[PDB]
């Protein structure tokens, strides 16, 4: 099994070196066993944005045919981002198997992907109405949600 | 105001040179008088396409500043087309105001648009998620969803 | 035009008695004139509640056969409540003409319906699916996104 | 052509069904998102246990209107460094030349496998570029280093 082994990798080279303030591991299942495919992470926003002092959780998927196919990773349904679906899924060339997936992205590469999103959404894949909306044509409303989002995610 | 003497001429306009299957009109009000910034109007799929033989129904919402802002153009909430939101508004970048409206625009050129965009999914608008997996990931799929939708929307 | 009658009724009024904090008006069409078949309205949190110190925005939408049928009233399109709809509309037995809705019923007491609904969810009415999960599984996470809302729709 | 379309439309659905691990081959999108059936992006990762290890280099595959006929072009980015890439980044490969070992019914795979044996094996036949031939046949350890490097420059 290739995506199994692959995932005990990626999570002995998380647990070795990982960026500050992010956390990802996997979920725990009924007999208190790990469920490898399936991980709870969280993001930092960047100081010196609006998105600083939360921490935005992700859940990471991996499909059977990982690493071939990328994993589908999720902000929680209702998340406020120009480029996160309704569902949370977030839209992003590195996890799209048609776009910009290798086999060899690493988790780290992943989480720094998102967290670079976020406080710099991407115009040629609006995934979202109201955030592309008020993002394109009220940015001092767009702002507002963001640091109230933000308040939501902080300690 | 020039909005309203524009729509009147839309419609004296439309009444006389518009592509054939469509339809277009505004809707009535209380009074039966018409509401000229609200209009029904309907887009024939094209022959030889899976969207063949319906007609699907959209408002156009036309805002006080037009024809200096674009309309807003709806489907059904629900409707089923990468291109458009989980709010039925369609993604089209000649009713973006950044992009390619342009206040000579016609209503008739607003409808072929739309029509255009039905079998030809534009990449830069990931607006609804499930459609796009489909488009991308299983179209035998996508295609049976859109013959039955086809059919919603039949005679 | 029974239905504008009785619309430039309810306008005359509301100007001349309405509740302190609550604002509503018929927006303005583009030559300037009221449009009656549709106001924009504002619905103060009452003090000592969660949803003290917002005026949440909402719009009322008269169709043709008022007042025989009920407006239907709605908040932004993601307006956090169990009874709000993912659109925005509100479900409320007063609202619902097979329910209490009364050709009698006014404007004003409709938006203290609408009030009285922020702070007391319906459970009959599970309209939105993670504010109604969080009122039943996770008080302290509803009560916290109630409070940001509140600050959302702040003065 | 209309044979070329055809042969396209499949070549995509059994690559897109059954390709080897680490490769990527795809038809270009044109202004629309409608794909260009004859021009494709494709990616040939280096061997394990060779120089070229870690690297994925990408290629382009141009499709005569005459194909299956003729053969495509492949290229590697222009200054791609290997004894057997031309300045313009175009793989000369017997499969890939008709006047040597292009037959019609060659797929993608084929191909692709092809340049990926090319890498770490090259053809003293086809010296193509002179400095990477130079090198590789003058001074080995200057040719791995570049290699090495060019693994990194392209790293999976």
Same mark, same amino acid.
């Given at each position: 099994?290739?995506?199994?082994?692959? &995932?005990?990798?990626?999570?002995?080279?998380?647990?070795?070196?990982?960026?500050?303030?992010?956390?990802?591991?996997?979920?725990? /299942?009924? *007999?208190?066993?790990? *469920?490898?495919?399936?991980?709870?992470?969280?993001?930092?926003? /960047?100081?010196?944005?609006?998105?600083?002092?939360?921490?935005?959780?992700?859940?990471?998927?991996?499909?059977?045919?990982? %690493?071939?196919?990328?994993?589908? $990773?999720?902000? %929680?349904?209702?998340?406020?981002?120009?480029?996160?679906?309704?569902?949370?899924?977030?839209?992003?060339?590195?996890? !799209?198997? *048609?776009?910009?997936?290798?086999?060899?992205?690493? &988790?780290?590469?992943?989480?720094?992907? $998102?967290?670079? &999103?976020?406080?710099? %959404? =991407?115009? =040629?894949?609006?995934?979202?109405?109201?955030?592309?909306?008020?993002?394109?044509? !009220?940015?001092?409303?767009?702002?507002? /949600? $963001? &640091?109230?989002?933000?308040?939501?995610?902080?300690?």
């Amino acid at each position: 099994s290739l995506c199994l082994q692959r &995932l005990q990798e990626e999570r002995k080279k998380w647990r070795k070196d990982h960026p500050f303030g992010f956390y990802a591991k996997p979920v725990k /299942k009924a *007999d208190g066993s790990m *469920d490898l495919q399936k991980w709870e992470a969280g993001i930092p926003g /960047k100081e010196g944005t609006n998105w600083a002092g939360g921490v935005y959780p992700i859940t990471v998927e991996y499909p059977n045919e990982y %690493p071939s196919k990328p994993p589908k $990773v999720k902000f %929680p349904a209702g998340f406020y981002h120009p480029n996160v679906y309704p569902s949370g899924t977030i839209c992003l060339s590195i996890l !799209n198997e *048609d776009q910009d997936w290798r086999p060899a992205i690493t &988790l780290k590469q992943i989480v720094l992907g $998102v967290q670079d &999103l976020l406080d710099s %959404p =991407n115009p =040629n894949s609006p995934a979202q109405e109201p955030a592309w909306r008020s993002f394109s044509r !009220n940015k001092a409303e767009y702002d507002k /949600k $963001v &640091l109230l989002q933000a308040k939501q995610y902080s300690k």
